[PDB]
């Protein structure tokens, strides 16, 4: 008869926040904020939120709580031809889950290796270090060479990732069994948090979403107590208003607030589906996003205080110590800074645990949206048991992550995250933004909000959904397609054909949306105007 609901408002109120907050909030925002105007990056970061991010977040969050349908069945009630979107996202998810979990696997392997009294990445007398390995608490006067490496860089590169055993994308096999066991434990800890439905995913989030703020607080007062930490904050907040003249940093801010907010994917749709009909949507979206940004903001300090201390211990120019913009900023730089602090075991355990709890909530929701849609599209054909479907998804993602668990797995992570998944999620998000605003009608949407909340949404939001948001996504998509960034990772430049592979994976994700449009266009009898009329008008 009817579907389930939430156990408490706070459970989903923290579930959506837990999905929104992840690793990128911690480390992607501080770097891009430091190199694009410093504190002045705060100005375009908010403008792209109020006009781009918040309208998509709220508009996405409203439809779910109004229609109470999955990512697939909701299109049958809006624009059946666009039902392929609900499938596209599914395929998209299969790609996303192929790498997003492996990162956590790395953190887990770093956590289980942090139970030793002497942390592995402090000394160089290990079984994986080379002759270039030079650590501290060693002879003074040491001078760095073009070939010299640090015990942290050696530990990440040659032990956990083991990327020295592959020559690139061409030859990357085989699979590392350690990270396979790690990602199995992770795929097990997400199973028991989803298999029961929204009951456990609203209860497990209590831990996964609150721990990172505590850990960030400890790391904050720690990095604030470190000598010479003001340099990282200065480099973090130094206004460079000339960056605002470049048309690039605005696109960077737009993309950053889009992926951090994460609209258009059906996760917010599914989370909103299980909720009260008369429940407020405005305040929910507002609070959650503003926290997601604030959390990024304080995370900036959490990183740059420690990196400032690292620049003080070395010789300044935080850009030099923060050259690498990736996991290496956390797994090498930040970790090496942790190793040189008292109670290093503590600050390592809580750090990697923080990473894992940062990732878990987003993977809970990440799967939750797809599971919800599929069950809603194939009801009671499906839903006979939930644990069965959730297990069938988790295992598929595990076999889908074996390509990422290889020695040259990080390369595939970059390729899929930047050349494949990204432009496809932006594309399908653009398709949704166009469909809801220009097909279903923005006036009827404001009428639905007027039904739930009791009042029609303001003109400020209507004018955003009509024009501001679709142009907001269009600008980012066009900016990427016009000039895809040259990929580089660990002194290795990607081949020229990488963009061909990424686009191949990207297009293969939404091959379902136009072919489904052709499907319904080929299924409905009569004239094409009557078929597109039964395809544009919701089900009678």
């Amino acid at each position, epitope marked *: 008869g009817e579907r389930e609901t939430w156990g408490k408002k706070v459970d989903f109120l923290l579930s959506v926040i837990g999905y929104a907050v992840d690793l990128g909030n911690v480390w992607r925002f501080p770097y891009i904020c430091a190199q694009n105007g410093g504190g002045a990056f705060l100005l375009p970061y908010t403008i792209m939120a109020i006009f781009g991010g918040i309208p998509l977040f709220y508009m996405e969050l409203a439809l779910g709580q109004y229609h109470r349908n999955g990512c697939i069945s909701i299109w049958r009630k809006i624009c059946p031809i666009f039902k392929g979107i609900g499938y596209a996202i599914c395929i998209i998810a299969f790609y996303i889950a192929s790498y997003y979990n492996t990162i956590m696997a790395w953190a887990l392997y770093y956590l289980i290796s942090s139970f030793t009294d002497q942390l592995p990445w402090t000394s160089c007398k290990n079984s994986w270090n080379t002759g270039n390995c030079t650590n501290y608490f060693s002879e003074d*006067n040491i*001078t*760095w*060479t*073009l*070939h*010299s490496t640090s015990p942290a860089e050696e530990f990440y590169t040659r032990h956990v990732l083991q990327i020295h055993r592959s020559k690139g994308l061409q030859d990357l096999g085989g699979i590392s069994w350690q990270l396979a066991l790690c990602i199995m434990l992770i795929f097990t800890v997400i199973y028991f948090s989803i298999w029961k439905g929204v009951k456990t995913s609203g209860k497990v989030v209590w831990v996964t979403a609150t721990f990172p703020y505590i850990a960030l607080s400890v790391l904050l007062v720690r990095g604030a107590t470190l000598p*010479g930490a003001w*340099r990282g904050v200065l480099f973090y907040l130094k206004p460079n208003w000339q960056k605002l003249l470049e048309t690039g940093v605005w696109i960077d801010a737009a993309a950053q607030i889009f992926f951090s907010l994460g609209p258009g994917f059906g996760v917010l749709l599914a989370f909103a589906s299980y909720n009260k009909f008369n429940n407020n949507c405005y305040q929910d979206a507002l609070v959650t996003s503003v926290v997601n940004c604030m959390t990024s903001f304080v995370s900036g300090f959490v990183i740059f205080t420690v990196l400032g201390y690292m620049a*003080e211990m*070395r*010789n*300044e*120019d935080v*850009s*030099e110590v923060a050259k690498d913009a990736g996991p290496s900023l956390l797994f090498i730089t930040y970790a090496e800074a942790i190793a040189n602090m008292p109670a290093s075991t503590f600050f390592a355990i809580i750090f990697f645990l923080m990473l894992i709890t940062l990732g878990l909530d987003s993977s809970f929701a990440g799967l939750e949206g797809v599971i919800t849609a599929v069950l809603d599209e194939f009801p009671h054909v499906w839903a006979k048991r939930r644990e069965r479907f959730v297990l069938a998804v988790v295992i598929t993602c595990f076999f889908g992550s074996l390509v990422t668990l290889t020695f040259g797995g990080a390369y595939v992570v970059k390729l899929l995250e930047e050349y494949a998944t990204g432009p496809a999620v932006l594309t399908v998000a653009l398709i949704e933004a166009v469909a809801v605003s220009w097909f279903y009608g923005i006036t009827q949407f404001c009428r639905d909000v007027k039904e739930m909340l009791g009042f029609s949404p303001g003109w400020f939001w209507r004018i955003c959904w009509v024009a501001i948001s679709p142009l907001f996504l269009l600008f980012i998509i066009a900016s990427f397609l016009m000039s895809p960034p040259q990929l580089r990772l660990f002194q290795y430049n990607y081949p020229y054909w990488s963009i061909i592979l990424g686009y191949a994976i990207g297009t293969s994700s939404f091959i379902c949306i136009p072919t489904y449009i052709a499907y319904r266009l080929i299924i409905t009898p009569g004239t094409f105007k009557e078929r597109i009329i039964k395809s544009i008008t919701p089900e009678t």
Partner: antibody, heavy 119, light 108 residues
Framework: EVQLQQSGPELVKPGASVKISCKAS????????MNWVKQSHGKSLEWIGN????????SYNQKFKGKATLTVDKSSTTAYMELRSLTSEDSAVYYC????????????WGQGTTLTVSS | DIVMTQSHKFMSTSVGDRVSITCKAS??????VAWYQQKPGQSPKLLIY???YRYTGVPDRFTGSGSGTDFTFTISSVQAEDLAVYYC?????????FGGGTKLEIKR
């Protein structure tokens, strides 16, 4: 016996180009950044840019972007700097100096190259 | 960028006196200052690195001190062959800049 032997003096007409060499010896050539410092007559030193010999990893100065081009040859352990669009301001003494990654000091310098840009 | 300012373009000293050259930077530098010696007609020669540390092959009479923006290069016993132009240079932020240069003239 770390020695950096540059090329001789060059007299070139304004608007032309000039290439200066830098033969290195006495150390592992693939271990250190190779730099080029411009010193004007009676002025101070002015860092032009470095280059990574392993892959040719150049790093120029914003003041010299598009003015100097650094190359390197591992087969003979020799660095090169080319200057185009020569004017009267380019008539100065140029050095090529070895430098580690950190701390970035200039331990060994070349003998210098007196460049005269005049017709 | 960084502006390494040497206020004293010329300094006079005698054989055996204690001479100290100052170097003023734009921002805070911590301990990233190098002192080079360039004799008239020769290439610059590295003397001090990282504020105080001496390089290999440098007499003990050349010292260095300072931590922040103002730095000092000190010579205890000035010799006749110590006649050269001294330069200070920051080595933290890109690009690496130099000082104006202090031509040390000997008084007799």
């Amino acid at each position: 016996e770390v020695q950096l032997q540059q090329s001789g003096p060059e007299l070139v007409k304004p608007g032309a180009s000039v290439k200066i060499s830098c033969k290195a010896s006495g150390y592992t050539f693939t271990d250190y950044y190779m730099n080029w410092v411009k010193q004007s007559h009676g002025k101070s030193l002015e860092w032009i840019g470095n280059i990574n010999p392993n892959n040719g990893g150049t790093s120029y100065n914003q003041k010299f972007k598009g003015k100097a081009t650094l190359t390197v040859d591992k087969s003979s352990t020799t660095a090169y700097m080319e200057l185009r669009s020569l004017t009267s301001e380019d008539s100065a003494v140029y050095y090529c100096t070895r430098s580690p990654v950190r701390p970035y000091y200039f331990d060994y310098w070349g003998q210098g190259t007196t460049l005269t840009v005049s017709s | 960028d960084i502006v390494m300012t040497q206020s004293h373009k010329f300094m006079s000293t005698s054989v055996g006196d204690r001479v100290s050259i100052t170097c003023k930077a734009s921002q805070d530098v911590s301990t990233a200052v190098a002192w080079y010696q360039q004799k008239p007609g020769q290439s610059p020669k590295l003397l001090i690195y990282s504020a105080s540390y001496r390089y290999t092959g440098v007499p003990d009479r050349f010292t260095g001190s300072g931590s922040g923006t103002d730095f000092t290069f000190t010579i205890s016993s000035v010799q006749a062959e110590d006649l050269a132009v001294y330069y200070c240079q920051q080595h933290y932020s890109i690009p690496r800049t130099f000082g104006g240069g202090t031509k040390l003239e000997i008084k007799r």
